[PDB]
Amino acid sequence: YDGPMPTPRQKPFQSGSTPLHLTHRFMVWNSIGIIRCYNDEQDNAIDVEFHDTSIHHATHLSNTLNYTIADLSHEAILLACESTDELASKLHCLHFSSWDSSKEWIIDLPQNEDIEAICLGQGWAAAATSALLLRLFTIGGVQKEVFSLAGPVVSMAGHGEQLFIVYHRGTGFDGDQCLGVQLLELGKKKKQILHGDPLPLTRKSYLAWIGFSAEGTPCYVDSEGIVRMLNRGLGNTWTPICNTREHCKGKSDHYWVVGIHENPQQLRCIPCKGSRFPPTLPRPAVAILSFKLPYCQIATEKGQMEEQFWRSVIFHNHLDYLAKNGYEYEESTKNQATKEQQELLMKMLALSCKLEREFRCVELADLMTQNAVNLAIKYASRSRKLILAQKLSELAVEKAAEL
Amino acid sequence: YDGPMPTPRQKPFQSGSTPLHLTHRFMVWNSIGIIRCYNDEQDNAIDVEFHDTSIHHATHLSNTLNYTIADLSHEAILLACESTDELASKLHCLHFSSWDSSKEWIIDLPQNEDIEAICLGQGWAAAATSALLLRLFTIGGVQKEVFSLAGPVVSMAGHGEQLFIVYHRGTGFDGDQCLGVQLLELGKKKKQILHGDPLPLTRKSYLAWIGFSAEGTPCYVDSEGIVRMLNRGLGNTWTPICNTREHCKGKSDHYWVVGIHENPQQLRCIPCKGSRFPPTLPRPAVAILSFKLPYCQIATEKGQMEEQFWRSVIFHNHLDYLAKNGYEYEESTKNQATKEQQELLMKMLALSCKLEREFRCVELADLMTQNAVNLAIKYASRSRKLILAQKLSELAVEKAAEL
Amino acid sequence: YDGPMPTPRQKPFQSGSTPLHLTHRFMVWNSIGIIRCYNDEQDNAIDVEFHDTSIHHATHLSNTLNYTIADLSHEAILLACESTDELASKLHCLHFSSWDSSKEWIIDLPQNEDIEAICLGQGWAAAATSALLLRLFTIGGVQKEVFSLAGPVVSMAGHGEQLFIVYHRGTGFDGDQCLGVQLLELGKKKKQILHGDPLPLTRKSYLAWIGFSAEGTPCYVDSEGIVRMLNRGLGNTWTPICNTREHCKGKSDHYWVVGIHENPQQLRCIPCKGSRFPPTLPRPAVAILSFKLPYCQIATEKGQMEEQFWRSVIFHNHLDYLAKNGYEYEESTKNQATKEQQELLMKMLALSCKLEREFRCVELADLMTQNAVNLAIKYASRSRKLILAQKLSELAVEKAAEL
């Protein structure tokens, strides 16, 4: 027939890695460091580098078992290899931060089970296998819980107690993938935050990179340069926070995401000219792109301030998440966020007042604090906006009644 | 091959509209009013009518931008048009209920982004775009939050703070659609009630109409005349409440749903002979169909009363929803519902008692109030049903212990 | 084309039944009893047997209506038949445990609606029909709620107030099924525990058996012998608890699951040589297989004890479920479970201490009770593990601070 064709399911990958066929490739490049693998026919070597030299010294390994998957954190180095006709699939952990004399452990998966993806969390490690199993391990080598995956894994990321799994929930058509996300919190109270929700992607695009921001919010990038971030303040939906194609000059130009930071806001990525991944040598330079939510009429003052407001809102939801889970957060960052947002609301209200859009001013005042609304009332008494001042006063009464 | 064939995904639509190819078509017909579009080669006009003349005067617009999507509420008129080679896709709002002198605003979507569906809520508006984005706007023109859709939108509806999105979650086979529902509450505490649950449809049918009842419960109709309603009292499942094919006399006869009302119960729709949608002229007459849940042996007294009981139960769940969300509800309606249900239970218990089904009587008494159970005990002492009276007494003891 | 092919959706089935084409087949074989159907051209008979003769006497029925689906519980016998050109699809219940003189009821489904699956709960019965409807009935014959199914049903099971539905959520490819699970609790507070989550299956396998353990935990088996159980302590994920292929000697050997028991742990199944289901005559013998979670390096002492620990953890989650839902549970079973787990942790800590893996000892002590940690501190003071004793002491301080 001549209709829709099933899209081939994309293969699993480690975020921040370059393809396996390269002689000198990146196994992982994140906010902790870089892991490179030089593999020809004579020898196979793995080199580990840390951005902060104080964390650990540079580590060089002789890749005898031919490790093809790697992840790096401030605690350990995680390595994995598939099975051969003689050896089993192995998970290798270099626990360099351990305070004891045993800084290494390795485990063999059962017969005919191959590791397809790994990720490192805070004090734990996870491995998705060809048996549609997810195996949890402590950073010291204890086997934790095991559960089955609803489909073949695509990529896996970890941060703190959070586990971020993207897998094939179905079969897409006409170039589209059919991906689902399983988001778990592996603390003392186990929670499945997302029960295989559909992962939004740009049409005819595939998954290019997943992970967490340094502050601990799940994020991912598709092959069309669209960067999306979990919106905890919007029912755990996914909000686009950047479009790396706006910084590209041609079709063959791409950006290779390395890390995401919310405070200060910066998207650390490698500019790539001619391909989607940078060559290992010479050392590529990390670029810093700004985040921009895809808002309408962003060239106008209204659209510009509206984008700044909602970007400030979503990039400070992590403070509430750190508070709800007992983590440590700076109360000063929370206060600066509110002041930054109340200033943008006040400037947007003054703009709507100049445009004789007084109903819009009351809508903006609904997002304001009680102090900001009281200030907007006196600004409305000024400039002879008498009815607007009355509507704002009635809004201030309603806000005080909500307490 | 000769097997299952992929079903073509149905295109987005506005509920209560007639096809675009008509010279004189309905853009939207709901419980607020009617919006018609007359478009030939000479001129293009849009006419707005309100069922209640006291709400607003009849509005006539010169459709210069060729708006093809429309929605209507007691607050504003929402219009949208796709992009051309010279103009961008635009969202136009006629805020006629505004108390200020600015009763109009329009916004341009970014390049190559087209509006595919719109809907109006209480004080807000939403637009699903070709970029798989959902854009939220206040009724006054402020851009609110934005998040990505898991698939191409099919239809969109709003009521109060609720957002009702139906989209393609996959690809169906053999005439079946693969639809998912995302139900959000956009109040001060954002909630995603349904994380893309599968939307039940009749086999080989497509989505024909979605929306909310006047009381605020999500409902939808498929192409086979099956009307389904969210059952908040049954874990947010979907319960069939009507079958418009029972009122049709032939295959070519159809009913075109306009609105759904829970108190009093009535399904307002347009009878259509020969097609699925009514012609614009002459003005079609609104028919009132009754709701009937698809219960077994409904011709018998037992099945008839069982259908009346569960229809009364599901059509009063909205009272609990209005109470939990601080909305205003009549306590008298809640009391009349319970009295209506306790009377049906009492008549079903008397029927089971006549049939010497005393175990069934105790099952019916489990659904009764403590006062109704006490009354059933004295009715069981009467007519010499001594063991039944003892079982009902032990049930009354258990009910008092649950407090 | 030459690519992925759509997998034909498997047909609905009753768990514990043998195919319909057999002259003498099992309609259901569970922990309550056996129901056999002998059907040739001369006569059609249904025989009911109870494992405990004290429950009820053996029942013999003349299958005049040609019932093809059956389920059995300690309360009633449930039978169902499809519709013919003269008769409707019927649901027949033999309420043998009733304390009244009416121990039978039957109901007719509407025109062109056929029963596809049934299941028995505590005091209720459910039937999934060809109209994509789920109909609830009390054990005495009262019609309860009705809601629509997101797809064609595959199998259905019930236990207490829990309803376990597996259905087709999509179309799989290359031999894979696309199954979803809807898990409901039908008590006085209706809950949808699983909103159509994807059902994990072994690749290229189909669903072979579903049901609940005697303690009330959902479980299911695929065609590759993998037995999975709901992990309530792991965010309602699914954990493999057995692999019946490890007990098979050849490809043609299979195990036919009958029941699952958590305390004592035993998987009751019928060994089958040459086919997937046992012949009705002679009476097959019920085998008892042990549960084994698929852990790595299970031949070693570490892997063996780690498997025993997590098997003990998951097979005692039902005690917490019985407690949260007011059911009756033995506090002695909960105490024996903790003692069994603290002993395994203590032996694993002593093993890690012998291997000079002191960081791993602290990880194991995190899973210990406060008394077990205090004991591990004195064991660390012994054998001159001074730093380990300090780390365990700081862990004991942190545990006391969590109260």
Residue numbers in the entry:
A (entry chain A), B (entry chain A), C (entry chain A): 421 to 823
Paper text:
This is a likely consequence of its sequence similarity with Ctf4 (21% identity and 36% similarity over 722 out of 1129 aligned residues) and their shared domain structure, comprising an N-terminal β-propeller domain and a C-terminal SepB domain, the latter being responsible for trimerization and for interactions with proteins harbouring a Ctf4-interacting peptide (CIP) motif. Here, we show that the SepB domain of AND-1 is a structural orthologue of yeast Ctf4, that it exists in a trimeric form and that it binds to Pol α/primase, like its yeast orthologue Ctf4.
Despite the low sequence identity (17%, based on structure superposition), the AND-1 SepB structure bears a remarkable resemblance to that of yeast Ctf4CTD, with the same tertiary structure comprising a six-bladed β-propeller fused to a C-terminal bundle of five α-helices, and an RMSD value of 1.8 Å over 305 Cα positions. In the AND-1 structure, the trimeric arrangement of protomers seen for Ctf4 arises from crystallographic symmetry, and it was confirmed by size-exclusion chromatography multi-angle laser light scattering measurements. Indeed, inspection of the putative binding site for its client proteins, based on structural homology with the Ctf4CTD structure, highlights a solvent-exposed hydrophobic patch formed by M766, A770, A792, L795 and Y799. The pulldown experiments showed a clear interaction of Pol α148–171 with AND-1336–826, which was not observed for the double alanine mutant. The resulting dissociation constant of 39 µM showed that the interaction of AND-1 with Pol α CIP is surprisingly weak, and prompted us to ask whether other regions of AND-1 and Pol α/primase contribute to their reciprocal association. Crystals of AND-1 329–826 were grown at 9 mg ml−1 using the hanging-drop vapour diffusion technique, in 0.1 MHEPES pH 7.0, 1.1 M di-sodium malonate and 0.5% (v/v) Jeffamine ED-2003, supplemented with 0.36–0.42 M sulfobetaine NDSB-195. The protein crystallized in the cubic space group F 4 3 2 with unit cell dimensions of a = b = c = 249.72 Å and one AND-1 protomer per asymmetric unit.
